[PDB]
Paper text:
Although DDD508 originated from the same chromone-containing series as our previously published [name] inhibitor DDD706,(8) DDD489 is structurally distinct. DDD489 and DDD508 showed a loss in potency against the modified strain compared to wild type [name], providing evidence that [name] was indeed the molecular target for both compounds. One compound each from Class II (DDD489) and Class III (DDD508) displayed superior efficacy and lowest parasite recrudescence in the NOD SCID Gamma model and merited further investigation. From the BCS, it was likely that both compounds would have low oral bioavailability due to suboptimal absorption because of restricted solubility (DDD489, Class II) or permeability (DDD508, Class III). However, DDD489 (purple) reduced parasite shedding below the LOQ and was able to prevent parasite recrudescence. All individual animals were negative for Cryptosporidium infection after treatment with DDD489. Additional mouse models allowed us to differentiate between the two late lead compounds as DDD489 was superior at preventing recrudescence. Conversely, calves that were treated with either DDD489 or DDD508 did not shed any detectable amount of Cryptosporidium during treatment or up to 7 days afterwards (to day 16 PI), demonstrating excellent efficacy. Resistance generation towards test compound has previously been observed for another [name]-synthetase inhibitor in the calf model.(19) To understand if the late and sporadic shedding we observed could be a result of resistance, DNA sequencing of [name] was performed on fecal samples recovered from each of the three Cryptosporidium positive calves from the study with DDD489. No mutations of the [name] gene were observed in any of the oocysts shed from any of the three calves, confirming that this effect was not due to resistance generation in the target, [name].
Numbering used by the authors:
A (entry chain A), B (entry chain B): 45 to 545
The structure:
């Protein structure tokens, strides 16, 4: 583009001519919001020539009325302000009027000095005496996001989106608000925030494939964490009683509308809680947050974008419970075979997958067959926030056995609109079984399950030091933001999401 | 150890005998702190047989004073409570007294039921009627950390440290407190907290060697971030005006008393600030925090451990400023040669390193020679919090040129006791020079500097959209905690630090 070359040329001319070239410091008198608060209610035509103010922003508009009168719009911190540059007021010590204003283009970051007030037409304005070019824009911008080559530019160059699109800026403000709310909830319960390692010698705590890396000086290979769970439980052994962590997990898997290779998770571990206690807590925390944000527990969601259909999601507590196996058996019209991890049941589940046209997993472990069936028959029933509960042990290697139900565990997942938000259980604290389930997992891994985790002997050793009865819990913050902010694409709620190259 | 085998054997016997085996849920009447608050001031010998309470904790002591009377200490949430188990009071429906208490060992997590009050000797106590084994400890514990095989166990098995050492628990409480204080500081200034990616296609923003990894589905190699700087500055282009991030950096380098391959950094970017503004902010923030924690700006530090010498560090503002080159030239007793990146000056600086017995760097870039000299002559003068300022451009590729001093930049580092805490500058916002400095860096990388960063074209493109005059800043949280908590080893302030294997 000729535009970019010419701008570099202009800037060189400016520098060689000793005119202001990327000034180090511009001292604003106040923010534009603070300016609008102070002068926004004056009478039309008001002007205070006894007050000289410095304002700065990005130029969004340039209109000349004549050779002697120029109108700018500047924008900063969510506030627009009009600048009215009259040659009569121009401070000649900063250069000839025409020269000073010839250096300014739309998109430029500029400073102005002058007198506060309002135009006769009633527009909040600064009656300028000078202009300074602080940081030029070397590209022709559109006036809105619809003027971009394509809408993927919004993600590859988020600065453009944030520049031009208020709706985008609002998502990240809301993200901050929601996380404050969540921290505060747990802070008031006497929780302690902790940081456990993102570099792991052994990955674990989730069904996910890891990123791999290497620490050269210590000549050891490492994994990025898929979850902090195995570390956090050790803190409960250590007696910290109530801990939470909020931070990135890394999952080496495909991207789509609800997946990004890194995302923000929260986990908490609470000693002496069980999964029943955690369901109540989840309801209180999430319903509270929804209410804080929306003023109501019934909120809009647009699955197919903002001009498509609108459904209502009802966060009124208590939420529906679906029992994992029973709901699968309702869909099937007959019972799964027992034991659930028997060859008999693996075969049966394969048969049922073919019959109901469900894509089979690989490998064909009982765990992954159960997961496919739950995805078809149960997750699809979860429009309003719903708990799927009482997952089989065979797919729940870190969850404590159900106190009433054989083969099951004290686990729940929270689904909203068929997407998983939370995953929680009464924590397994018996090390003999834990070692056994880790072995079954390593066996699955060797059989080609890329989401099965290796044995962690250090974790087993920690359990041998006595983990109190404990309840644990994780939440995908980003998917939560998708619901609160009404977005159907993860890329909307992460500043710099991953993209195909 | 026979002990571990026998405990597994006991637990099997318990299960086969139908006795309580890892109960799922134990409902406490109140916390131990709450128990101490309620019954701590009763008269000696008080007992309320009309109130039955459930308490739980980890057993820290077992004294059988006779065949009929056992004294336990349990500990939980920073509170010890004595249990007095009299055969006279035992609920026989839970088993024979001797049988019930034979299942309990030091280190066990246990529940007790009984009557609140105080012993005749005046010890806060529960007069128990039952005991439940909730989670046994299968290993013989010491009573304090000095009873561990070696003191590195504290780090390889942090649960033991946290179990046994109050001072350890205090560090991580203080860590949480300090980060709350810091977030609050910036929150009240109208900052927005953000998350930028830890998986990067191009690493940048610091002198550090990166971890390397690979995203299989997108068939692309990735770096873990060494700093969020290049992303964060794009948010200022986008107009967010004030942003901070608190989160892990990853640096693939050797470990020692002040280095860990991952650590917690905070960066913030404030539009319209310069490095002068940032020095004032740093003083206010850190002096405030010190005062909050210590009740004074003068605090103790033990560089050689708790039985060694003690220095006093004085955080009284304003802090000393040392000009980088001038202080080096004072130490040398002559001037560096100009330009600073000339072959003449490289040679000179090599000569001076040999003369003053300073370990040479590899490769021998001007930047790294300057660093070694600053390490010898300037960093060593920084006992009390001190700013080193006005670093050469050649070692400061993202810092804006000094407005007065040729070849220098508007940068500072904050040092306390010769260790770096902060690094900050008036941000370079001129894309022509930025591209040039990135080229010099890539050239250094190709010459074998593993801490030099490649060119980031996407960042250059962002600068071409106009970065406002901006001030940026980073802080090593963990090193700060070392000073606040008086620890001379990074491993003290990170829950699960890296270890040689
Ligand atoms: N690759 C990937 N994987 C997951 C998620 C994401 C993303 F970007 F959408 F945020 N990307 C997510 O939100 N997930 C829900 C899980 C539901 C249960 C709790 C966990 C937890 F604990 F990690 F937060 C997340 C998976
Ligand atoms: N490998 C490594 N490197 C650094 C640090 C650490 C550790 F473990 F101590 F935390 N380990 C640290 O604290 N560093 C100070 C820097 C001082 C200036 C600001 C930066 C920043 F940006 F990361 F905050 C940290 C380096
Ligand atoms: N680690 C789980 C969340 C916590 C489960 C309960 N301990 C996950 O990533 O899904
Ligand atoms: N990225 C720097 C901190 C910020 C420097 C100022 N932009 C570091 O890691 O030391």
């Amino acid at each position: 583009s000729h535009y970019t070359d010419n701008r570099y040329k202009m800037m060189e001319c400016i520098k060689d001519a000793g005119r202001p070239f990327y000034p180090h410091k511009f001292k604003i008198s106040m923010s534009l919001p603070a300016y609008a608060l102070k002068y926004g209610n004056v009478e039309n035509g008001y002007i205070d020539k006894d007050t000289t103010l410095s304002l700065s922003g990005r130029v969004t508009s340039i209109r000349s009325s004549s050779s002697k009168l120029i109108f700018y719009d500047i924008f900063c911190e969510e506030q627009k302000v009009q600048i009215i540059a009259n040659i009569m007021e121009h401070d000649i010590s900063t250069g000839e009027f025409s020269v000073s204003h010839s250096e300014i283009r739309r998109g430029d970051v500029v400073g102005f000095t002058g007198f506060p007030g309002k135009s006769k037409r009633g527009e909040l304005s600064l009656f300028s005496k000078s202009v300074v070019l602080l940081s030029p824009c070397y590209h022709m911008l559109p006036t809105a996001i619809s003027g971009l080559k394509d809408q993927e530019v919004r993600y590859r160059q988020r600065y453009l989106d944030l520049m031009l699109n208020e709706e985008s800026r609002k998502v990240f403000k809301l993200r901050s608000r929601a996380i404050k709310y969540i921290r505060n909830y747990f802070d008031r319960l006497g929780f302690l925030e902790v940081e456990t390692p993102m570099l792991n010698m052994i990955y674990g705590g989730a069904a996910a494939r890891p990123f791999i890396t290497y620490h050269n000086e210590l000549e050891t290979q490492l994994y990025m964490r898929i979850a902090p769970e195995l570390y956090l439980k050790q803190l409960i052994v250590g007696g910290l009683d109530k801990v939470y962590e909020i931070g990135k997990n890394f999952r080496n898997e495909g991207i789509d509308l609800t997946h990004n290779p890194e995302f923000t998770a929260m986990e908490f571990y609470m000693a002496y809680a069980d999964y029943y206690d955690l369901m109540d807590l989840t309801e209180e925390l999430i319903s509270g947050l929804v209410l804080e944000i929306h003023g109501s527990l019934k909120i809009p969601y647009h699955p197919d974008g903002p001009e498509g259909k609108c459904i209502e999601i009802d966060f009124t507590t208590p939420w529906k419970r679906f029992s994992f196996v029973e709901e699968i058996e309702s869909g099937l019209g007959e019972k799964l075979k027992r034991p659930l991890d028997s060859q008999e049941n693996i075969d049966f589940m394969v048969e049922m997958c073919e019959k109901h046209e469900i894509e089979l997993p690989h490998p064909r472990t009982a765990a992954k067959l159960l997961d496919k069936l739950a995805g078809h028959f149960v997750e699809t029933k979860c429009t309003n926030p719903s708990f799927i509960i009482d997952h089989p042990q065979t797919m729940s290697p870190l969850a404590k056995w159900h106190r009433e139900k054989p083969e099951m565990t004290e686990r729940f997942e929270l689904f909203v609109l068929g997407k998983e938000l939370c995953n929680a259980y009464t924590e397994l604290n018996e090390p003999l079984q834990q070692r056994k389930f880790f072995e079954q997992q390593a066996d699955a891994k060797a059989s080609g399950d890329v989401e099965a985790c290796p044995i962690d002997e250090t974790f087993c050793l920690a359990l041998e030091h006595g983990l109190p009865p404990t309840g644990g819990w994780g939440l995908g913050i980003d998917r939560l933001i998708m619901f609160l902010a009404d977005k159907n694409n993860i890329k909307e709620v992460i500043l710099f999401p991953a993209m195909r190259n």
